[PDB]
Structure 1
Amino acid sequence: ARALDLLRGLPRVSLANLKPNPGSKKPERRPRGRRRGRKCGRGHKGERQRGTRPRLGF
């Protein structure tokens, strides 16, 4: 084929070369820094923030 000819002049494939397909492994989000975490997205004081808002549909 065409690509199979490309592989001949590249380095050997091994577990040091692999990669995920771009766009698959979305990066993670952690509350650290001035953007992600100062209130970590939970908003001002209120039962929204503490994780105590009424049941779904109240």
Structure 2
Amino acid sequence: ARALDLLRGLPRVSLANLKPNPGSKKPERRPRGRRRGRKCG
């Protein structure tokens, strides 16, 4: 694999680098602001 060989050059994986797979977490919509809430849907 070329990918572990990429992991050499990168800083160490820590609890400060972690990130969910993009697409996993849809963002919560909540009723504040001009669009999400005046009559709030």
Q: TM-score range by the shorter chain?
A: over 0.9
Q: State which structure, 1 or 2, has the greater radius of gyration over its C-alpha atoms.
A: 1
Structure 1: gaps (5+ residues): 41-58
Post-superposition Cα deviations, 1:1-45, rounded to whole Å, max 9, x if no partner, equal 2100000000000000000000010000100001000000xxxxx
Higher helix share: 2
CA distance in 2, matches of 1:15, 1:26: 22
Normalised to the residue count of structure 2, the TM-score between the two structures is 0.94
Q: How many residues align?
A: 40
Higher RCO (C-alpha under 8 Å, 6+ residues apart): 2
The share of aligned pairs that are identical, in percent, is 100
Structure 2: gaps (5+ residues): none
* Structure 1 ranges of 4+ moved more than 4 A: none
